[PDB]
A = this chain, B = another copy of it.
Amino acid sequence: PIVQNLQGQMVHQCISPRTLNAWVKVVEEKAFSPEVIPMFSALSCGATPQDLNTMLNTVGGHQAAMQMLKETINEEAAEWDRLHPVHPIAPGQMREPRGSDIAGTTSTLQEQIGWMTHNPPIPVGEIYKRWIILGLNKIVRMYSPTSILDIRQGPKEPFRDYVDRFYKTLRAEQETLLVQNANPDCKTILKALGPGATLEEMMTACQ
């Protein structure tokens, strides 16, 4: 990553074994459950494009997913090139990043450091991270196991467990249905609650 040092200057630091291992095990244990996205974002804090590629490439499984992510990345890089075309460079001068440069495939670590620490800085790490998260959200939605239409409170299911399933599914797929899909008893209670009830009030009512 790029991080600030005691002297107050942005400098490159090696990605730590703890971060690498953390990402790899997150993916191993959670697959593409939605909460893996914020974790990724936090673990790639300050990441260069090289670091983002390191994190993605250290994943051993889910290679269908990783190829889909390559597709998204290439699409976003093509659009970047459409918006920001690039014009031999002047001796010793910063060149303009193209899509494959932001994705870290045609740019060196040193060039990425130069862009990210330029004044004004070109945050190629954050732009690339945005593309990656776009692709990852596509994957989260794709691997969502169940439709919100199929989450219905069981006849003996505590209302809390049902709401947990409901908003877990809703998060993967990225509230009147909540009442509609409740079971008869709770549905009666919630119908009686009236309009404008908070989720807190509903969960207390069916407790």
A residues touching B (Cβ–Cβ < 8 Å)? 1, 3-9, 11-22, 30, 33-35, 38-39, 41-43, 45-46, 53-54, 57-68, 71, 138, 142-143, 160, 163-164, 166-168, 170-171, 198-200, 203-204
Which residues of chain B are near A22, meaning CB under 8 Å?
17, 20-21
Check if A60 sits within 8 Å of B33, measured CB to CB.
yes
Query: Shortest CB–CB separation between residue A30 and chain B, in angstroms?
Result: 7
Using Cβ atoms and an 8 Å threshold, which residues of chain B touch A18? 17-18
Q: Which residue of B lies closest to A22 (CB)?
A: B17
From residue A198, how far is it (CB to closest CB) to chain B in Å? 6
- Other-chain residue from B13, B45, B58, B167 in contact with A63 (beta carbon distance below 8 A): B167
Find chain B residues with CB under 8 A from A21 CB: 22
Given the known interface contacts A6-B6, A6-B7, A60-B33, the answer about A43 and B67 at a Cβ–Cβ threshold of 8 Å is: no
Q: A138–B60 contact, CB under 8 A? A: no
Give the dominant DSSP class at A's interface.
helix
**Are A142 and B68 in touch, CB under 8 angstroms?**
no
Tell whether, in the assembled complex, residue B7 and residue A20 are in contact, meaning their CB atoms are under 8 Å apart. Answer: no
Q: Is the CB of A35 within 8 A of B60?
A: yes
User: What residue of chain B has the Cβ atom nearest to residue A204's Cβ?
Assistant: B142
Chain B residue nearest to A35 (CB atoms) is B60
Contacting pair B7 A8 (CB below 8 A): yes
Q: Most chain-B CB neighbours within 10 Å: which of A58, A163, A168?
A: A58
A164 CA / B143 CA spacing, docked (Å): 13
| Contact in complex: A199, B14 (CB < 8 Å) | no
- Which residue of B6, B45, B142, B164 contacts A15 across the interface (Cβ within 8 Å)? B45
